[PDB]
């Protein structure tokens, strides 16, 4: 998770400048091997998010997720479907086996003149006790 | 290094 340090304030700024509330196609980086976000690398990443900081207790959203996931794919080579969580009813538990963060619910001049949402929670047993599997048993066999 | 090498002698007596 070395080249994930150089965009650790840079992409998070674009996440935080993204509101939590041309181009066509998909390029693939040549000759770089691709793999999903594996278990021990998610253990390597959940501790990378535990140690580098700036993520815990932040306002999670989907626009921030997609800014983040494609940046992992283009700079680290990982399939950007790993940051998937359980839907609306219930705690937004990760479907990813190894992601130890569950999602609980919680510039300035773009406002007009007179005027006429989630967050992380570290759960180290989400890597072993797949709580999203308890929320979705029939999908995981 | 795409260029290739050339072997020199050892002694040159």
């Amino acid at each position: 998770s070395k080249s994930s340090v150089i965009g650790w304030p840079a992409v998070r700024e674009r996440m935080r400048r993204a509101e939590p509330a041309e181009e066509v196609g998909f390029p693939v980086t040549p000759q770089v091997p691709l793999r999903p976000m594996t278990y021990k690398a998610a253990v390597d990443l959940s501790h990378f998010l535990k140690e580098k900081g700036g993520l815990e207790g932040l306002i999670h959203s989907q626009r921030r997720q997609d800014i983040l996931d494609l940046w992992i794919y283009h700079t680290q080579g990982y399939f950007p479907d790993w940051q998937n969580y359980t839907p609306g009813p219930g705690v937004r538990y990760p479907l990813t086996f190894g992601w130890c963060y569950k999602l609980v619910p919680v510039k300035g001049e773009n406002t007009s003149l007179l005027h006429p949402v989630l967050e992380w929670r570290f759960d180290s047993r989400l890597a072993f006790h797949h709580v999203a599997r308890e929320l979705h048993p029939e999908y995981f066999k | 290094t795409s260029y290739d090498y050339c072997r020199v002698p050892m002694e040159d007596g």
Partner: protein, 415 residues
């Protein structure tokens, strides 16, 4: 003679601080950058500043200001040679040396500051031997650290025995606006890549003029080295006698020697350029590039950097062979030719416009620098004759070399 060597950034905050005498206060660093703002903006920039009696020896990295402070009449070249060495050793440790290299790796870097220098006296700066007891991953110091041979540890062992040499030419050129060659020296540099077993004493011989004059072969092909600067490991007292390049190499990649010589023969590629600068209107560069060098040889991936005006606009390029990219970011054109053999002569006709309003200020005249590279081609004609592998164990190594001729400072002063 250092007292407190500091590392700043482009903002002037201390990346890392280390004193060696206590004779310079640690808060003196905060005056340096405003004095650096002072001396530069008045053009009185020097690598030494002074806030009263504290002398500010500094170099400048990409982000970094390796500021070594002192107060007395310190030995100056003692400081700066160490400064580029610390850059070098950090480059040996950290493949890029930036703010991320410092603030993430302060575990080892303070230990380096403890180790490289005591009191202002550098004592151990060979990074390859320094790797053996200063790791970022402690045992006793090696004997090579104690030893007068301080560049090569014993017991180094490989499966094969490969001696990879790189005789590299670097053609300097100064052609004025008159079209005469002002200064064309050649600084060649043989850099060795040693992969050998044990402790060998390598003895090298070239087509030296003086060594052929001592032999009596001063009528055949002999390069005349005006000055060489060698590695430490070359026993220069043995070389001073009879041109004897005898040394125990370190292990791995290192530059052994640095020869320099003048050459009164033509440049390998002559450039003729013109400028039809029409006032408020346009500019035209009908530039050709003839190759004076050998036809068997081919100048690889040449990159002719011709400085264009800043507000030059609407580029047009009638080349012959080779593409132009216009680089307004450097305010220039790179007429790039990949394969350009000797004897070849390729024209390029450039055409810009110019704003009908003039600019406010002048621009000055940068010369044209090209980025040629010719392999297997010694322009000075230097030839390695042999390489004597001398091991007490005794083996037959594999000595190997390739010849590459590039530019040094290939400046050609424009119109």
């Amino acid at each position: 003679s250092a007292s407190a060597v500091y590392v700043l950034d482009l903002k002037g905050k201390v990346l890392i601080c280390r004193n060696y005498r206590g004779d310079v206060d640690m808060s003196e660093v905060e005056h340096f950058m405003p004095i650096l703002m002072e001396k530069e903006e008045e053009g009185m920039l020097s690598p030494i500043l002074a806030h009263g009696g504290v002398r500010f020896m500094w170099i400048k990295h990409n982000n970094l200001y390796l500021v070594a402070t002192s107060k007395k009449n310190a030995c100056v070249s003692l400081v700066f040679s160490f400064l580029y060495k610390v850059v070098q050793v950090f480059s040996e440790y950290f493949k890029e040396l930036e703010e991320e290299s410092i603030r993430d790796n302060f575990v080892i870097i303070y230990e380096l500051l403890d180790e490289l220098m005591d009191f202002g006296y550098p004592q151990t700066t060979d990074s390859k031997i320094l790797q053996e007891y200063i790791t970022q991953e402690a045992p006793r110091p090696p004997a090579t650290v104690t030893n007068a041979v301080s560049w090569r540890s014993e017991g180094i062992k490989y499966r094969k025995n490969e001696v990879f040499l790189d005789v590299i030419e670097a053609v300097n050129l100064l052609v004025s606006a008159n079209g005469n060659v002002l200064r064309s020296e050649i600084v060649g540099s043989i850099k060795m890549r040693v992969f050998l077993s044990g402790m060998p004493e390598l003895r090298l011989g070239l087509n030296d003029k003086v060594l052929f004059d001592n032999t009596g072969r001063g009528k055949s092909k002999s390069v005349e080295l005006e000055d060489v600067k060698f590695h430490q490991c070359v026993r220069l007292s043995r070389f001073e006698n009879d041109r004897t390049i005898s040394f125990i190499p370190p292990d791995g990649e290192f530059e052994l020697m640095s020869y320099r010589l003048n050459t009164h023969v033509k440049p390998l590629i002559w450039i003729e350029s013109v400028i039809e600068k029409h006032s408020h209107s346009r500019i035209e560069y009908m530039v050709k590039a003839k190759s004076q060098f050998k036809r068997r040889s081919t100048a690889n991936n040449v990159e002719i950097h011709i400085p264009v005006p800043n507000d030059a606009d609407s580029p047009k390029f009638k080349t012959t062979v080779g593409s132009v990219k216009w680089v307004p970011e450097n305010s220039e054109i790179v007429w790039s030719v990949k394969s350009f053999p000797g004897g070849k002569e390729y024209l390029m006709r450039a055409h810009f416009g110019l704003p009908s309003v003039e600019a406010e200020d002048k621009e000055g005249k940068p010369p044209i620098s090209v980025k040629f590279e010719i392999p297997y081609f010694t322009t000075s004609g230097i030839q390695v004759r042999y390489l004597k592998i001398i091991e007490k164990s005794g083996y037959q190594a594999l000595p190997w070399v390739r010849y590459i001729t590039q530019n040094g400072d290939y400046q050609l002063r424009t119109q």
